[PDB]
Amino acid sequence: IIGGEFTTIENQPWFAAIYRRHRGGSVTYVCGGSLISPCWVISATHCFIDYPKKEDYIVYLGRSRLNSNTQGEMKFEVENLILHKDYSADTLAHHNDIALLKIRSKEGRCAQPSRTIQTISLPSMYNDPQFGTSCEITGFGKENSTDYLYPEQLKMTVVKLISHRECQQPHYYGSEVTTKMLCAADPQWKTDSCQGDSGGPLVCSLQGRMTLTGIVSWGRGCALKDKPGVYTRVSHFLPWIRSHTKE
Ligand SMILES: N=C(N)Nc1ccc(CNC(=O)N[C@]23C[C@H]4C[C@H](C[C@H](C4)C2)C3)cc1
């Protein structure tokens, strides 16, 4: 996250930190995610497409820091890794960038709600916030494009939803952005998501309720003018979500 402020999971209780186990013992951060139900975390396919082995992943809930523990945190294994079949990456655009992770602790249990571990509500069919609405993103991604390390503390920022008409302009993204995606940016172009934030949530207060409106997916650079962050439009994948979570 470029700009914004440091935060704690108590403020973003639905945030899930996904790491990958390496040959030896080193565990590195991969992507963000969101707990949509005690047993399910939703993230981005881009994060796992090159290493589809569910056994190599670890999911943390109630975690505020990258390489250090946080009391109340819970560690989970990935029972099932569901990648979207029609995922594809173009020059800039990442299509159907969405994934589901069924989690379970070593005792075979799912997440237990607490002050640091809470689920976020999914949107209603095709019901998205009006463009111009303020929403928040959270992640452990880069703070500057020139950084090669991720911040140690969770971050968050507020961005505004941009209409498809505006995001489809020539100087923005043109025809690369689709109706299955949502654009969001800071009117001042000072804050934005960046590498390492993929899979994280774009949360919007819709009708007095915190809703998982989007998933961090792609964008040209980070916090560059006329280049908004692009998010996977969750409301258009409800059938997909429901069909893979049932069983
Ligand atoms: N302008 C933006 N908001 N630009 C934007 C938007 C989304 C992203 C997120 N994209 C990523 O996190 N990329 C990866 C690319 C690969 C190495 C790591 C882990 C995953 C695979 C995801 C970083 C980047 C840049």
Note whether 95 and 125 are same-domain residues.
no
10 Å CB burial of residue 27 (0-12, 13-18, 19+) is middle
10 Å CB burial of residue 24 (0-12, 13-18, 19+) is exposed
DSSP code string of 154-218: -EEEEEEEE-HHHHTSTTTTGGGS-TTEEEEE-TTS--B--TT-TT-EEEEE-SSSEEEEEEEEE
> What separation in Å is there between the alpha carbon of 177 and the centre of ligand 1?
16
The resolution in Å comes to 1.8
The 10 Å Cβ neighbour count of residue 79 is 13
Domain count, the chain: 2
Note whether 135 and 87 are same-domain residues.
no
Of 94, 95, 97, 217, the active-site residue reads 97
The whole domain housing 214 covers 1-12+120-235
- Which residues is 80 bridged to in the sheet? 102
Note whether 39 and 107 are same-domain residues.
yes
User: Of the residues 172, 198, 225, 230, which should be mutated to test ligand 1's pocket, given the most ligand atoms within 8 Å of the CB?
Assistant: 198
Q: Is 90 a catalytic residue?
A: no
Note whether 105 and 153 are same-domain residues.
no
Note whether 20 and 114 are same-domain residues.
yes
Exposure pattern of 85-102 as b/e (b: 16+ CB <10 Å)? eebeeeeebbbbbbbbbb
Q: How far apart are CA 211 and CA 123, in angstroms?
A: 6
Distances (CA, A) of 243 to 78, 119, 187, 205: 19, 19, 37, 26
Q: Is 171 a catalytic residue?
A: no
CATH code at position 103? 2.40.10.10
Note whether 143 and 228 are same-domain residues.
yes
Q: How far apart are CA 19 and CA 78, in angstroms?
A: 11
Note whether 206 and 245 are same-domain residues.
no
Amino acid at 192: D
Q: Is 192 a catalytic residue?
A: no
Of 174, 176, 140, give the one whose Cα is nearest residue 16. 140
Q: How far apart are CA 45 and CA 107, in angstroms?
A: 27
Q: How far apart are CA 170 and CA 176, in angstroms?
A: 10
Q: Which two tokens stand for residue 157?
A: 């920022």
Q: How far apart are CA 196 and CA 150, in angstroms?
A: 7
Give Rg (Cα) of the chain: 17
Q: How far apart are CA 48 and CA 233, in angstroms?
A: 19
Altogether, the residues listed in the chain come to a count of 247
Q: How far apart are CA 110 and CA 119, in angstroms?
A: 12
Q: What angle is formed at CA 2 by the lines to CA 167 and CA 7, rounded to 5 degrees?
A: 120
User: Residues with Cβ < 8 Å from 15, sequence gap 6 or more?
Assistant: 9, 32, 33, 34, 35, 63, 138, 154, 200, 201
Q: Are 87 and 49 in contact (CB under 8 A)?
A: yes
Q: Which two tokens stand for residue 190?
A: 């000072």
Note whether 241 and 231 are same-domain residues.
no
Note whether 149 and 161 are same-domain residues.
yes
Q: How far apart are CA 228 and CA 209, in angstroms?
A: 25
Q: Is the dihedral of CA 138, 30, 194, 166 positive or negative?
A: negative
Distances (CA, A) of 216 to 25, 174, 205: 28, 19, 17
Note whether 158 and 179 are same-domain residues.
yes
Note whether 169 and 192 are same-domain residues.
yes
> What separation in Å is there between the alpha carbon of 198 and the centre of ligand 1?
5
Ligand 1, atom 21, residue with closest C-alpha: 47
Indicate which technique resolved this structure: X-ray
Note whether 106 and 196 are same-domain residues.
no
The residue to which tokens 């523990």 are assigned: 69
Q: How far apart are CA 9 and CA 138, in angstroms?
A: 10
